[model samples]
Target: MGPGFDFAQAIMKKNTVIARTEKGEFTMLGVYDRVAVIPTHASVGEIIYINDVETRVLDACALRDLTDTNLEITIVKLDRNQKFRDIRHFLPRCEDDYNDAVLSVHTSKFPNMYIPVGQVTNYGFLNLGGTPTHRILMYNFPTRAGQCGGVVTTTGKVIGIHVGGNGAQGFAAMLLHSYFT
Candidate 1:
């Protein structure tokens, strides 16, 4: 919570994208290269809006009903050299000893952007594709629209897409690099 506070503030603002799909608005996480990880529940047939710009959905892990811990690591590929940031984002783990004070940065077209601070409460299992995955993390923070593709950060290290949550507690998908090998 020192200089990295502003650093995280600036970096996340530049990196994060607000996704407006036919279903609803959600957050699209920024990662290495210039791609977005959106919620798996989104359909490619629906038109998408990234902030002020319009776009389309590309590769999604799967399109199904979302549970507590599966967001399918979909990629919202940015065209040309416009609103894309070449930043690295990931999910460390639920037991990692770092970043007790975390921030959830989300924004919309006309609403105030929220950067809420919360701590990792614990880890839980993911019900991905009707099977299972490992632990996904949860924190004590109020939820918001366009926050479904959630990314929580202490600096520039860890980030997870929001899968599901109540208003009080938000569950995040720890499958950032899962789209890779």
Candidate 2:
């Protein structure tokens, strides 16, 4: 609880948006002043409630497929630009490695709690019913609904976005630099 605690305190205070889609409800991790990235599945042009007072969400990408990997994420553009007191300060480079302990912060359901140090068991699709390159399998992670789009931080950097889960295993979209650049 040294550096990790500090990292948690820094990120947890950032703005987190609650997205309500026809499929279900989920959370979004604020990345930019007006842009917050969420799972493609949860970006169905739904209503995003910010601070439980302000409502937003204009247009979002359908589904951006990551090249050379089986992962997909969405970039949300809010109708009205909203500024956050503490925006994201780090952009973690995506990695395709096994057995890396990463931290995940889910603000929707978990509420500022950090899912401390979960290992990435594998990258790429593991028969989770999505495109070939749209999933990362991890073990020992207690994932729950409405937690999708939460930031998966490794060493204080957001490496991925929590998307789905099955029992003790979970899936995330590795935030590759090429996707945005």
Candidate 3:
């Protein structure tokens, strides 16, 4: 934690958007104070609904294909900003410790529900979307349908976005610091 950084305050109060596709609807996290980041596998070519208000997808990228160095993440650009965060509400990732206990906020499914603690087990590659993409392994986390794309954070700052989970473990796309910087 640092001065002017409050993880709970920023994330808890932050809003989440719903990604609607022909198949179904999934939750997504608002990142970079602008775009929505969802599981690339879970959502593709879908419309985003922010609190019942709809927004079109301007641009989307399976970042893993463009950059092998990053996670198997998808960044979706909203056609317009929804005015979610404050001008100074931005909080960077905790660069010093990746082992900190963090919370995963799933606003769509469990409104005001907080999974108090999940940790980053490792940063490695996974054969996701038919390719080996960098991903952060998380363990000891809860599961629920449409929980993907929720933001994960420590007490100090935001860490990543929940992608998917398999049994006792899960994965999250590391928050893109470049987007904030």
Locate the minimum summed-lDDT window of 10 residues in model 3: 87-96
Q: Compare candidates 2 and 3 on TM-score and give the better one.
A: 2
* Candidate 3: pairs in clash: none
lDDT of each: 0.57, 0.61, 0.60
Q: In model 3, which regions exceed 4 Å deviation? A: 1-6, 65-70, 86-97, 129-131
- The pairs that clash in candidate 2 are 70-133, 70-134, 70-135, 71-133, 71-134
Tell me the deviation in Å of residue 63 in model 2: 3.7
Q: lDDT by residue for model 3 over 35-147, one digit each (tens)?
A: 66777675567566655667777888877524656465677778765555632244453333355555545444566555655456665666644556674656576655566
Span of 10 residues, lowest total lDDT, candidate 2:
84-93
Candidate 3, residue 102: lDDT: 54
The C-alpha stretches of model 1 lying farther than 4 A from their native spots are: 1-4, 63-72, 80-83, 89-98, 109-112, 126-134, 144-146, 175-181
lDDT assessment of candidate 1? 0.57
lDDT top scorer: 2
Clashing pairs in 1: 26-146, 27-146, 150-162
Model 3 gets an lDDT of 0.60
What TM-score does candidate 2 get on C-alpha atoms? 0.76
Candidate 3 residue 6 C-alpha distance from true site, Å: 7.2
Alpha carbon RMSD to native, model 3: 4.1
Tens-place lDDT per residue, model 2, 1-181, is 6665565556656656666566655666666657767776664655665545445566677453535543557777776556644344465444566444455454445666666645675566555555555546465776777667766665546567777777777777776555554
Could you give the candidate ranking by lDDT, starting with the highest? 2, 3, 1
